[PDB]
Amino acid sequence: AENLWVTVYYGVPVWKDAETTLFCASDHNVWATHACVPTDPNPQEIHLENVTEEFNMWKNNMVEQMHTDIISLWDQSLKPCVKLTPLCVTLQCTNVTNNITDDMRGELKNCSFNMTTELRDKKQKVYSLFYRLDVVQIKEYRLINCNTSACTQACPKVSFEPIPIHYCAPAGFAILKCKDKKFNGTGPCPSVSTVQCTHGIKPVVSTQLLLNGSLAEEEVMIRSENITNNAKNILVQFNTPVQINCTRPNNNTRKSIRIGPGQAFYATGDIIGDIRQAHCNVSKATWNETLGKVVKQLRKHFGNNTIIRFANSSGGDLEVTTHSFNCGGEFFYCNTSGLFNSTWISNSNDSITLPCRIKQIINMWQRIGQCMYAPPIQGVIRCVSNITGLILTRDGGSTNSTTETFRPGGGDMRDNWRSELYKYKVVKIEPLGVAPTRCKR
Amino acid sequence: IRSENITNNAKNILVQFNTPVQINCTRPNNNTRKSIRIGPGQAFYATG
Amino acid sequence: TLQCTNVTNNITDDMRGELKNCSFNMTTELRDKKQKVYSLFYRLDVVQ
Amino acid sequence: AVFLGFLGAAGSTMGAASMTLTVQARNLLSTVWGIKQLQARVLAVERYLRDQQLLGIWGCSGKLICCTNVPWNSSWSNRNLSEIWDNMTWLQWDKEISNYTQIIYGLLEESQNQQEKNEQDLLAL
Amino acid sequence: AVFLGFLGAAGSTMGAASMTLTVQARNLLSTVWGIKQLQARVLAVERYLRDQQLLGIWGCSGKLICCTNVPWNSSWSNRNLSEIWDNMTWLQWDKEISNYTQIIYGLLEESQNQQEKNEQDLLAL
Amino acid sequence: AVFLGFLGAAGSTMGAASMTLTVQARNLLSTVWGIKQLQARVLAVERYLRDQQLLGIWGCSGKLICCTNVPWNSSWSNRNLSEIWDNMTWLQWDKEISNYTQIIYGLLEESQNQQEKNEQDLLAL
Ligand SMILES: *[C@@H]1O[C@H](CO)[C@@H](O[C@@H]2O[C@H](CO)[C@@H](O[C@@H]3O[C@H](CO)[C@@H](O)[C@H](O[C@H]4O[C@H](CO)[C@@H](O)[C@H](O)[C@@H]4O[C@H]4O[C@H](CO)[C@@H](O)[C@H](O)[C@@H]4O)[C@@H]3O)[C@H](O)[C@H]2NC(C)=O)[C@H](O)[C@H]1NC(C)=O
Ligand SMILES: *[C@@H]1O[C@H](CO)[C@@H](O[C@@H]2O[C@H](CO)[C@@H](O)[C@H](O)[C@H]2NC(C)=O)[C@H](O)[C@H]1NC(C)=O
Ligand SMILES: *[C@@H]1O[C@H](CO)[C@@H](O[C@@H]2O[C@H](CO)[C@@H](O)[C@H](O)[C@H]2NC(C)=O)[C@H](O)[C@H]1NC(C)=O
Ligand SMILES: *[C@@H]1O[C@H](CO)[C@@H](O[C@@H]2O[C@H](CO)[C@@H](O)[C@H](O)[C@H]2NC(C)=O)[C@H](O)[C@H]1NC(C)=O
Ligand SMILES: *[C@@H]1O[C@H](CO)[C@@H](O[C@@H]2O[C@H](CO)[C@@H](O)[C@H](O)[C@H]2NC(C)=O)[C@H](O)[C@H]1NC(C)=O
Ligand SMILES: *[C@@H]1O[C@H](CO)[C@@H](O[C@@H]2O[C@H](CO)[C@@H](O)[C@H](O)[C@H]2NC(C)=O)[C@H](O)[C@H]1NC(C)=O
Ligand SMILES: *[C@@H]1O[C@H](CO)[C@@H](O[C@@H]2O[C@H](CO)[C@@H](O)[C@H](O)[C@H]2NC(C)=O)[C@H](O)[C@H]1NC(C)=O
Ligand SMILES: *[C@@H]1O[C@H](CO)[C@@H](O[C@@H]2O[C@H](CO)[C@@H](O)[C@H](O)[C@H]2NC(C)=O)[C@H](O)[C@H]1NC(C)=O
Ligand SMILES: *[C@@H]1O[C@H](CO)[C@@H](O[C@@H]2O[C@H](CO)[C@@H](O)[C@H](O)[C@H]2NC(C)=O)[C@H](O)[C@H]1NC(C)=O
Ligand SMILES: *[C@@H]1O[C@H](CO)[C@@H](O[C@@H]2O[C@H](CO)[C@@H](O)[C@H](O)[C@H]2NC(C)=O)[C@H](O)[C@H]1NC(C)=O
Ligand SMILES: *[C@@H]1O[C@H](CO)[C@@H](O[C@@H]2O[C@H](CO)[C@@H](O)[C@H](O)[C@H]2NC(C)=O)[C@H](O)[C@H]1NC(C)=O
Ligand SMILES: *[C@@H]1O[C@H](CO)[C@@H](O[C@@H]2O[C@H](CO)[C@@H](O)[C@H](O)[C@H]2NC(C)=O)[C@H](O)[C@H]1NC(C)=O
Ligand SMILES: *[C@@H]1O[C@H](CO)[C@@H](O[C@@H]2O[C@H](CO)[C@@H](O)[C@H](O)[C@H]2NC(C)=O)[C@H](O)[C@H]1NC(C)=O
Ligand SMILES: *[C@@H]1O[C@H](CO)[C@@H](O)[C@H](O)[C@H]1NC(C)=O
Ligand SMILES: *[C@@H]1O[C@H](CO)[C@@H](O)[C@H](O)[C@H]1NC(C)=O
Ligand SMILES: *[C@@H]1O[C@H](CO)[C@@H](O)[C@H](O)[C@H]1NC(C)=O
Ligand SMILES: *[C@@H]1O[C@H](CO)[C@@H](O)[C@H](O)[C@H]1NC(C)=O
Ligand SMILES: *[C@@H]1O[C@H](CO)[C@@H](O)[C@H](O)[C@H]1NC(C)=O
Ligand SMILES: *[C@@H]1O[C@H](CO)[C@@H](O)[C@H](O)[C@H]1NC(C)=O
Ligand SMILES: *[C@@H]1O[C@H](CO)[C@@H](O)[C@H](O)[C@H]1NC(C)=O
Structure with missing residues (x-):
């Protein structure tokens, strides 16, 4: 009665989850755009009507791919640069006592040492200024990295400024984007679109604070795997x-x-004028309002009558314990203790000042045996940035106490990338299909 | 037993x-x- | 330039002269300093 | 908005989605980064050739809609055309039938050769 | 001389040049230097597959001289066949009509699907 | 044992071996080691495309057993069908007639275009 027969359809709109390799799309720098494809001036996006798709930000392979690509580019950029192997020599250092304040005493050391020259059979006595965090006593000191590995110097011509990069999938694949606001990175998104490439993502390297990021379109959002x-x-x-x-x-x-x-080798000759600590400034009223919004949102998940506490970091390495970033080539490590210090109970122009330090021997990624010696930057430096997010960790959390203490977190760089690719996923199309149909061959 | 020649x-x-x-x-x-x-x-590893 | 001597500590007849106790100077982590060290080598690895 | 285009017909019914197969068909083909791009292009070419070979083996070469001689077994599916071609989406049908895939492929493959043999025999006369 | 072969018919008329399409058809497919050679081979394979797909979508798969159902618009060209197929070369025609290429392709693509649908409907009976 | 499968029909006669062309047809497509694997993969696609182009040019596109118009010359082979299709293997026939390969290819190529031209002429009316 039915008298149906099989029929083959090519080009059926069906997709399945898959993993592949994405490539560049961009408009001397560490993030090499030379080997990156140009971006189309008019990107195209196709909103899918009446299509709901499952999303999970904590199982995205795009984050792993981005981390691997960033590490590979960082390794590639440092290949054609000088190696500071001869620098491992016995230094003779003294305290700097020329126009310093009460907080920067002992932070700088005036060191002298012998060094090689262009001729193989000649030596020259030279001097330099080093930071206390870079020299360890062996009136004799040595670089901290000498007993770990000989490591190189970053070339002065390249720039560390982040540049936006778009990721594009190959032919036969597609990238699905969730346009549903208030989506918390896990669950069914009902508003979906197909995009050839992602939006510009700045590979900003920072810990304890998300800088120059993207802002939520509705209100403060809180995300967590569990x-x-x-x-x-x-x-x-x-x-x-x-x-x-x-x-x-x-x-x-x-x-x-x-x-x-x-x-x-580029050394810091001398400092002209006064010597003072580098520091950062944050608005007080704006920070208070932001923390009010944050605690308001946190009350939704952790009870309505609970006490919400912000305190200092537990401890560990300087990178994880302190807000670490870089501006203009200088690597800043700062003590965000005045910000996350308050308690909240259910019911003008002063600015918070963070005095903080600079470092030259850098181990950016969580690796042992490779440095990056930042050459000094000439003249005073300053910059302004946008704080657009936080990484927090709950301390303890047992049922014994009803007070919740949240502390700054960070360390792993995958969290920084996960904050931008939370609304993206990749699928592969399956054009072939079989159906029943009346006609017969 | 095998041999070319x-x-x-x-x-x-x-x-x-x-x-x-x-x-x-x-x-x-x-x-x-x-x-x-x-x-x-x-x-360098040596025999003590 | 290694300075080597015969080892004569609990050896049999067939293993006489097979091992040489050799001392020499060597570099270190710092390019300024040097350290005197010693090791044991095989007779097939050292030539006068 | 660009609602209609490429995969815009994903949420539509199978009958409505059957009118826009060409938009899906067109896009299937199209120093360290260059290596990744070349690998992806190689994989895409291999996948396209695999799909084309599978289509050609069944005798539906150079056709987007090609119904054949193999009858539909009621065991695989019981729903009638009334509640399929205008009351279901392609994704739902694929999800339901994804278990029963290879048997129909083998049936098509073994059916095509018999037709070829019969055509040769007819032309022999 | 080897006057005839591959592109030897470039200077001849379109009528004479249409007799030797196969010679052009055949040749379209076939440490640091090896990388360049591999890149060139990959690009050539991609171009050949693109051309084959474009031919297949219009329903002229496996054919060198295939006419179709889309009619010719007089606006695109006004010259008649008398002064075209024996009073013009392929290069001149391509130069003249390089502007109006994509519209004909779209018309062919949308025309093929209607024929396929009509054939399916006829075979349904 | 897996006697039947892929090349299991190599020792059988041509008549029996012609019943299992599909199993041979299917398998034709599918840090330092990765480079060698990629180089090997690049060649298989080229060989498959060359074979497909050679088949398509003769007009037997999308067919495993396709007869043509060129007659058989008695000079190339004198044995009749009685002692060929059931008293000989494909390897033996290929070994015997490996010398006379290209001429039939050229004849098929030149014959296909005449049929295409004639079909165009008949459809012109
Ligand atoms: C978040 O975003 C904001 C804004 O988008 C970022 O703030 C910007 O940061 C950049 C980089 O620090 C800064 O641009 C610099 O401005 C300086 C002052 O005008 C310039 O002097 C400097 O140029 C030097 O560096 C370039 C490479 O970056 C060189 O190409 C150039 O030739 C200059 O180098 C010369 O001078 C130096 C110093 O004397 C010398 O050592 C060299 O040899 C050479 O002679 C940059 O153009 C922007 O001005 C900042 N924007 C604002 C509004 O302040 C912020 O950094 C981002 N946050 C994070 C964490 O990245
Ligand atoms: C660091 O130490 C060096 C060496 O002692 C200082 O350079 C000397 O500076 C004095 C004057 O301040 C000169 O008279 C000497 O000739 C300099 N020595 C050499 C070798 O040039 C340098 O000034 C010190 N820097 C700081 C910041 O204290
Ligand atoms: C640079 O090298 C010179 C010698 O090449 C050092 O001066 C020597 O210091 C040692 C102390 O360990 C004395 O025993 C020698 O007598 C000194 N020799 C001379 C010629 O002065 C000098 O100290 C080195 N520079 C630094 C900063 O240590
Ligand atoms: C989120 O974390 C909690 C705490 O670990 C998980 O609940 C625990 O699950 C383990 C699994 O064996 C049990 O042993 C614990 O007793 C559970 N503790 C509590 C307080 O429930 C929970 O399963 C996690 N969420 C998900 C979705 O797995
Ligand atoms: C951060 O804030 C401090 C004050 O809390 C600023 O210090 C003042 O800086 C100005 C510079 O124009 C001086 O004129 C004042 O004398 C300083 N006052 C004090 C008390 O230090 C500091 O400049 C600010 N820095 C940034 C980068 O905004
Ligand atoms: C950070 O720096 C910006 C720019 O230097 C400051 O914005 C300026 O604020 C002053 C004081 O109100 C105004 O007179 C200027 O017109 C502002 N300039 C711009 C471009 O907005 C900002 O106030 C600083 N923030 C903190 C916390 O010190
Ligand atoms: C957060 O605040 C606590 C409390 O002040 C800091 O703990 C101090 O640590 C220093 C060592 O650097 C000690 O000398 C003080 O005695 C500690 N305070 C007390 C009350 O014992 C803690 O260091 C701060 N966080 C960071 C990252 O510095
Ligand atoms: C981060 O800043 C806080 C606030 O200034 C520091 O806490 C002070 O630490 C000193 C020791 O250097 C103590 O003498 C003070 O009593 C502490 N103040 C308070 C309010 O507890 C903290 O030490 C800083 N972090 C680091 C690593 O030095
Ligand atoms: C910090 O945030 C402000 C506000 O989002 C940024 O200013 C906006 O910049 C965009 C540029 O894409 C403009 O389209 C908006 O109109 C600006 N808004 C306002 C209120 O000025 C600012 O650019 C951000 N700073 C950095 C360094 O990214
Ligand atoms: C196996 O080796 C023998 C010995 O070489 C080959 O026989 C020799 O062939 C050479 C070829 O010019 C003659 O000059 C010698 O006089 C031969 N000697 C003997 C003892 O026969 C023999 O040909 C080799 N086997 C094969 C299959 O080539
Ligand atoms: C090889 O054979 C020799 C004897 O020819 C073994 O020598 C004996 O080793 C055992 C070890 O348990 C001793 O207890 C005996 O005293 C040895 N006897 C002599 C005469 O040497 C030797 O152990 C064998 N080695 C191996 C690996 O099988
Ligand atoms: C190889 O030679 C070294 C140096 O002569 C020996 O080490 C010495 O051993 C004696 C007694 O065992 C000690 O008193 C010395 O202090 C050691 N010297 C050093 C520099 O540590 C070593 O024992 C010899 N090894 C053998 C197998 O003969
Ligand atoms: C390690 O180096 C020291 C210093 O160069 C060597 O001792 C010297 O040896 C030479 C040649 O025998 C003498 O001329 C010097 O007078 C020695 N100087 C001292 C301070 O002893 C020593 O021989 C070297 N070690 C080895 C194993 O050759
Ligand atoms: C340098 O100053 C620091 C801090 O006052 C002190 O601990 C150190 O002993 C001083 N070193 C000198 C004077 O060599
Ligand atoms: C190098 O020295 C520091 C301090 O002296 C020590 O903490 C570190 O473990 C040393 N490195 C190695 C590889 O032992
Ligand atoms: C928020 O995340 C949780 C994680 O389990 C999920 O169940 C919930 O659906 C998400 N919220 C929305 C609105 O999707
Ligand atoms: C932390 O907050 C308390 C308010 O209870 C204040 O007394 C203290 O000075 C603050 N600490 C810092 C480092 O700002
Ligand atoms: C830093 O010193 C140089 C050299 O004296 C001078 O030209 C420059 O103006 C100084 N910078 C500032 C901010 O005063
Ligand atoms: C080799 O010497 C070590 C250290 O004395 C000892 O622990 C071990 O048992 C010895 N090996 C044998 C086979 O006796
Ligand atoms: C070491 O022993 C071997 C073998 O007995 C001998 O030939 C050699 O001369 C000896 N070398 C010495 C004692 O330095």
Whole structure:
């Protein structure tokens, strides 16, 4: 009666979850755009009507791909640069006692040492200024990295400024984007679209605070893989940014020492004028309003009558314990203790100042045996940035106490990438299909 | 027994057994290893 | 330039002269300093 | 909005979605980064050739809609055309039938050769 | 001389040049230097597959001279066949009509599907 | 044992071996080691495309057993069908007639275009 027969359809709109390799799309720098494809001036997006798709931000392979690509680019950028192997020599250092304040005493050391020259059978005595965090006593000191591995110097021509990069999937695949606001990164998104490439993502490297990120379109958002468990981090996304102004006011001076044939080491000659600590400024009223919004949102998940406490970081390495970032080539590590210090109970122009330090020997990624010696920057430096999110961790959390204490977190760079690719996923099309149909061959 | 040209002496002869023969090799000296740092992140291992 | 001597500590007749106790200078982590060290080498690895 | 285009017919019914197969068909083909791009292009070409070979083996070469001689077994599915071609989406049908895939492929493959043999025999006369 | 072969008919008229399409059809497919050669081969394979797909979508699969159902619009060209197929070369025609290429392709693509649908409807009876 | 499968019909006669062309047809497509694997993969696609183009040019596109118009010359082979299709293997026939391969290819190529031209002429009326 039915008298149906099989029929083959090519081009059926069906997709399945899959993993593949994405490629560049972009408009001297570490994030090499030379080997990256140009971006189309008029990107195209196709909203899918009446299509709901499952999303999970904590199982995205795009984050792993981005991390691997960033690490590979960082390794590639440092290949054609001088190696500071001869620098491992016995230094003779003294305290700097020229126009310093009460907080920067002992932070700088004036060191002298012998060094090689262009000729193989000649030596030269030179001097430099080093930071206390870079020299360890062996009146004799040595670089901290000498007993770990000989490591290189970043070339002065390249720039560390992040550049937006778009990721594009190959032919036969598609990228699905969730346009549903208030989506918390896990569950069924009912508003979906197909995009050839993602939006510009700045690979900003920072810990304890998301800088120059994206803002929520509705209100403060809280995301966590398992909010009940304290071992999983909590990502907070602001709906409005907070301006933070950081500056190093020391007038540094750069000099070049020839350590071999066509090899120069850049040292800090001397500081002109006064010597003062670098510091950052954050608005107080804006920070208070942002924390009010954050605690308001947190009350939804952790009870209505609970007490919400913000305190200092537990401890560990300086990178994880302190807000670490870089501006203009100078690597700042700062003590965000005045911000996350308050308690909240259910019921003008002063600015919070963070005095903080600079480092030159850098281990950016969680790796052992490779440095990155940042050459000094000439003149005073300053910058302004947007705080648009936080990474928080719950301490303890047992049922014995009704008070919840949240502390700053960070360390792993995958969290920074996960905050931008939470609304994206990749699928592969399956054009072939079989159906029943009346006609017969 | 296999050989490219058994008449010619310049070609090797490969003999494949039917059953294996157990051979037990041993070095009975109690060696000790010590690391000497020859540079930044470079160690040479020597018999102490 | 290694300075080597014969080892004569609990050896049999067939293992006489097989091992040489050799001392020498070597570099270290710092390019300024040097360290005197020693090790044991095999007779097949050292030539006068 | 660009609601209609490429995969815009995903949420529509199978009958409505059957009118826009060409938009899906067109896009199936199209220093460290270059290696990844080349690998992806190689994989895409291999997948396209695999799909084309599978289509050609069944005798529906160069056709988007090609119904054939193999009858539909009622065991695989019981729903009638009334509640399928205008009361269901392609994704739902694929999800329901994804278990029963290879048997129909084998049936098509073994059916095509018999037709070829019969055509040769007829042309022999 | 080897006057005839591959592109030897480039200077001839379209009528004479249409007799030797196969010679052009055949040749379309076939440490640091090896990378360049592999890249060139990949690009050539991609171009060949693109051309084959474009031919297949219009229903002229496996054919060198295939006419179709889309009629010719007089606006695109006004010259008649008398002064075209024996008073013009392929290069001149391509130069003249390079502007109006995509519209004909779209018309062919949308025309093929209607024929396929009508054939399915006829075979349904 | 898996006697039947892929190349299991190599020792059988041509008549019996012609019943299992599909199993051979299917398998034709599918850090330092990765480079070698990629180089190997690049060649298989080229070989498959060359074979497909050679088949399509003769007009037997999308067919496993396709007869053509060129007659058989007695000079190339004198044996009759009685002692060929059931008293000989494909390897033996290929070995015997490996010398005379290209001429039939050229004849098929030149014959297909005449049929295409004639079909165009008949459809012109
Ligand atoms: C978040 O975003 C904001 C804004 O988007 C970022 O703030 C911007 O940061 C950049 C980089 O620090 C800054 O641009 C610099 O401005 C300086 C002052 O005008 C310039 O002097 C500087 O140019 C030098 O560096 C370039 C490479 O970056 C060189 O190409 C150039 O030639 C200059 O280098 C010369 O001078 C130096 C110093 O004397 C010397 O050592 C060199 O050898 C050479 O002679 C940059 O153009 C912007 O001005 C900032 N924007 C604002 C509004 O302040 C912020 O950094 C982002 N946050 C994070 C965490 O990245
Ligand atoms: C760091 O130490 C060096 C060496 O002692 C200082 O350079 C000397 O500066 C004095 C005057 O301040 C000169 O008279 C000497 O000739 C300099 N020595 C050399 C070798 O040039 C340098 O000024 C010190 N820097 C700081 C910031 O204290
Ligand atoms: C640079 O090298 C010179 C010698 O090449 C060092 O001066 C020597 O210091 C040692 C102390 O360990 C004395 O025993 C020598 O007598 C000194 N020799 C001379 C010629 O002065 C000098 O100290 C080195 N520079 C630094 C900063 O240590
Ligand atoms: C979120 O974390 C909690 C805490 O670990 C998980 O609940 C625990 O699950 C383990 C699994 O064996 C049990 O042993 C514990 O007794 C559970 N504790 C509590 C307080 O429930 C919970 O399952 C996690 N969420 C998900 C979705 O798995
Ligand atoms: C951060 O804030 C401090 C004050 O809390 C600023 O210090 C003042 O800086 C101005 C510079 O124009 C001086 O004129 C004042 O004398 C300083 N006052 C004090 C008390 O230090 C500091 O400049 C701010 N820095 C940034 C980068 O905004
Ligand atoms: C961070 O820096 C910006 C720009 O330097 C400050 O914005 C300026 O604020 C002053 C004081 O109200 C105004 O007179 C200027 O007109 C502002 N300039 C711009 C471009 O907005 C900002 O106030 C600083 N933030 C903090 C916390 O010090
Ligand atoms: C957060 O605040 C606590 C409390 O002040 C800090 O703990 C102090 O740590 C220093 C060592 O640097 C000690 O000398 C003080 O005695 C500690 N305070 C007390 C009350 O004992 C903690 O260091 C702060 N967080 C960070 C990252 O510095
Ligand atoms: C981060 O800042 C806080 C606030 O200034 C520091 O806490 C002070 O630490 C000093 C020790 O250097 C104590 O003498 C003060 O009593 C502490 N103040 C308070 C209010 O507890 C903290 O030490 C800083 N972090 C680091 C690593 O030094
Ligand atoms: C910090 O945030 C402000 C507000 O979002 C940014 O200012 C906006 O910049 C965009 C540029 O894409 C403009 O389209 C908006 O009109 C601006 N808004 C306002 C209120 O000015 C600012 O650019 C951000 N700073 C950084 C360094 O990213
Ligand atoms: C195996 O080796 C023998 C010995 O070389 C080959 O016989 C020789 O062939 C050469 C070829 O010019 C003659 O000059 C010698 O006089 C031959 N000697 C003997 C003893 O026959 C023999 O040809 C080799 N086998 C094969 C199959 O080539
Ligand atoms: C190889 O054979 C020799 C004897 O020819 C073994 O020597 C004996 O080893 C055992 C070890 O348990 C000792 O207790 C005996 O005293 C040894 N006897 C002599 C005469 O040397 C030797 O152990 C064998 N080695 C292996 C690996 O099988
Ligand atoms: C190889 O030679 C070294 C140096 O002569 C020996 O080490 C010495 O051993 C004696 C007694 O065992 C000690 O008193 C010395 O202090 C050691 N010297 C050093 C520099 O540590 C070593 O024992 C010899 N090894 C052998 C197997 O003979
Ligand atoms: C390690 O170096 C020291 C210093 O160069 C060597 O001792 C010297 O040896 C030479 C040649 O025998 C003498 O001329 C010097 O007078 C020695 N100086 C001292 C301070 O002893 C020593 O021989 C070297 N070690 C080895 C194993 O050769
Ligand atoms: C340098 O100053 C620091 C801090 O006052 C002190 O601990 C150190 O002993 C001083 N070193 C000198 C004077 O060599
Ligand atoms: C290098 O020295 C520091 C301090 O002296 C020590 O903490 C570290 O473990 C040393 N490195 C290695 C590889 O032992
Ligand atoms: C928020 O995340 C939880 C995680 O389990 C999920 O169940 C819930 O549906 C999400 N909220 C929305 C509105 O989807
Ligand atoms: C830093 O010192 C140089 C050299 O004296 C001077 O030209 C420059 O103006 C100084 N910078 C500031 C901010 O005063
Ligand atoms: C933390 O907050 C308390 C308010 O209870 C204040 O007394 C203290 O000075 C603050 N600490 C810092 C480092 O700002
Ligand atoms: C080798 O020497 C070590 C250290 O004395 C000892 O622990 C071990 O048992 C010895 N090996 C044998 C086989 O006796
Ligand atoms: C070490 O022993 C061997 C063998 O007995 C001998 O030839 C050699 O001269 C000896 N070397 C010495 C004692 O330095």
